[PDB]
Write a protein that binds this ligand. Structure first.
Ligand SMILES: C[C@@H]1O[C@@H](OC[C@H]2O[C@@H](OCCc3ccc(O)c(O)c3)[C@H](O)[C@@H](O)[C@@H]2OC(=O)/C=C/c2ccc(O)c(O)c2)[C@H](O)[C@H](O)[C@H]1O
Ligand SMILES: O=c1ccn([C@@H]2O[C@H](COP(=O)(O)OP(=O)(O)O)[C@@H](O)[C@H]2O)c(=O)[nH]1
Length: 450
């Protein structure tokens, strides 16, 4: 079998481009040739991530200026929400530049997600298409699917959004109440068209749908998506990047070593979230209330000079050496692997969820976004490997709610903790079994050949 030539054209955001590159590295490792079309600024930021320079080539695509687009705006990270429709309109405008590159590259398969016009080019240039999604399967299945009717004229109510589309496999992986607002984007404008129109065209135009998940986690959701669009669904596995080697920072190791094994509660909310000052103070107070050792790695609240400035009065003093609150970036994998760490409080982002699943720590979830809430419902309610902190109307969580969730997984007495620990242990063993990740990548490649 001759090796494949795959072209990737992701939506212009670091959160989309990076998983596409990680998949490209796994494909190149197998000998396949990848051409990746991205703006230069993303190229400058992520270019070091290419581990196979002869197999993986970057092609710079220019983001055309359009009315309302800030100067030199190329990715979602450059603009805030007011520029979102200009950025999408500019993204659609690289169609002609993409067409010329595709006419030259002549790929066998093109990967895309938000560029719904790629299948039209698939007809003109002659290539197969996969609509490959970095978002979780349950979010796709509960949202933009033909079984859900989204009116063009009027927005969906909170009720319509909370109601899962007919045939949706799970009664557990659902949004509840005010959480439904987190799904409201599926109906919003996105450039010249509404988001759901763009995703519907993307899903229906492709030859197959690609999802970065595994069947053991999200199998019924993938089957629902396959039937809803009458498309095959190819599961790539999570395609997790290689763990960063190198030792843990010596001061962290020394501070962790003062504590007993599995006794330290670690907390981090990803590299995208910045908490408001009032939620931040409520969180650090919730960790103090537990009386257990804690390591909190969170960005300082926006507009705070320092972490110590943002802290509530008297916090530093009451806590002493029992807890650390650190504004800097930390080596999350190494800290979690440290014997002293016993609990992980996270927002259930994609990276943190898989790191939680693969680790030996207890799992405490404080989701914010719609996908995080759904992954939390999968982990806490269906799989029962985690506990979810109770939250308020805006996603607000009280210090007592956070404290109770931590004690419920940390106390040896707690029956809830023993159950999630046991269920967690089963799943960890499945996901770490040797060759489990590689089987998905190999099976992904074979489906591409079909
Ligand atoms: C602010 C974002 O706006 C919605 O997300 C919609 C999309 O928005 C994009 O951002 C580019 C525009 C932008 C740039 C800077 C900002 O400060 C800002 O607020 C908005 C992101 O890059 C996409 O990952 C995101 O897709 C998705 O996340 C969902 C994709 C999806 C969802 C359901 C489906 O069925 C499906 O096929 C795909 C949701 O509210 C997200 O939670 C939230 O992070
Ligand atoms: O202090 C930190 C915070 C985050 N991460 C890493 O950042 C990645 C992205 O986090 P996640 O996907 O969970 O959330 P997101 O950043 O996507 O919002 C994960 O692999 C974490 O290990 C890290 O190394 N140190």
């Amino acid at each position: 079998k001759p090796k494949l030539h795959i072209t990737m054209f992701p939506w212009v955001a670091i959160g989309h481009i990076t998983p596409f590159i990680h998949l490209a590295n796994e494909l190149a490792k197998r000998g396949h040739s990848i051409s990746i079309l991205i703006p230069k600024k993303a190229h400058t930021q992520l270019g070091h991530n290419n581990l196979y320079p002869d197999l993986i080539k970057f092609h710079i695509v220019t983001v055309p200026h359009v009315e309302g687009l800030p100067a030199g705006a190329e990715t979602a990270s450059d603009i805030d929400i007011t520029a979102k429709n200009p950025l999408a309109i500019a993204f659609d405008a690289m169609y002609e530049q993409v067409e010329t590159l595709l006419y030259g590259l002549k790929p066998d398969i093109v990967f895309y997600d938000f560029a719904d016009w790629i299948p039209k080019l698939a007809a003109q240039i002659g290539f197969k298409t996969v609509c490959y999604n970095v978002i979780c399967a349950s979010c796709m299945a509960i949202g933009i699917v033909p079984a859900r009717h989204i009116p063009k004229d009027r927005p969906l109510t909170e009720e319509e959004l909370m109601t899962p589309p007919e045939g949706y496999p799970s009664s557990t992986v659902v949004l509840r109440g005010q959480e439904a607002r987190t799904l409201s984007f599926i109906g919003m404008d996105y450039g010249a068209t509404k988001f759901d129109v763009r995703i519907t065209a993307a899903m229906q135009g492709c030859d197959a749908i690609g999802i970065r998940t595994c069947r053991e986690l999200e199998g019924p959701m993938c089957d629902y998506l396959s039937a809803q669009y009458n498309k095959p669904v190819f599961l790539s596995g999570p395609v997790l990047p290689e763990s960063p080697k190198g030792p843990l920072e010596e001061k962290w190791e020394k501070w962790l070593n003062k504590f007993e094994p599995k006794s330290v509660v670690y907390c981090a909310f990803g590299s995208q979230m910045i908490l408001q000052k009032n939620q931040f103070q409520e969180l650090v107070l919730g960790f103090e209330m537990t009386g257990l050792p804690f390591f909190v790695a969170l960005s300082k609240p926006h507009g705070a000079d320092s972490i110590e400035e943002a802290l509530p009065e008297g916090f530093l003093e009451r806590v002493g050496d029992r807890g650390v609150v650190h504004g800097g970036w930390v080596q999350q994998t190494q800290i979690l692997n440290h014997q002293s760490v016993g609990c992980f409080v996270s927002h259930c982002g994609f990276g943190s969820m898989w790191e939680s699943l693969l680790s030996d720590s207890q799992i405490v979830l404080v989701p914010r976004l719609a996908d995080q809430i759904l992954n939390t419902r999968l982990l806490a309610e269906e799989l029962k490997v985690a506990v979810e902190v109770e939250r308020g109307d805006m996603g607000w969580f009280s210090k007592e709610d956070l404290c109770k969730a931590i004690k419920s997984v940390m106390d040896e007495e707690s029956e809830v903790g023993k159950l999630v620990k046991k269920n967690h242990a089963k799943w960890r063993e499945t996901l770490v079994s040797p060759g489990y990740m590689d089987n998905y990548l190999e099976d992904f490649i074979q489906q591409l050949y079909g």
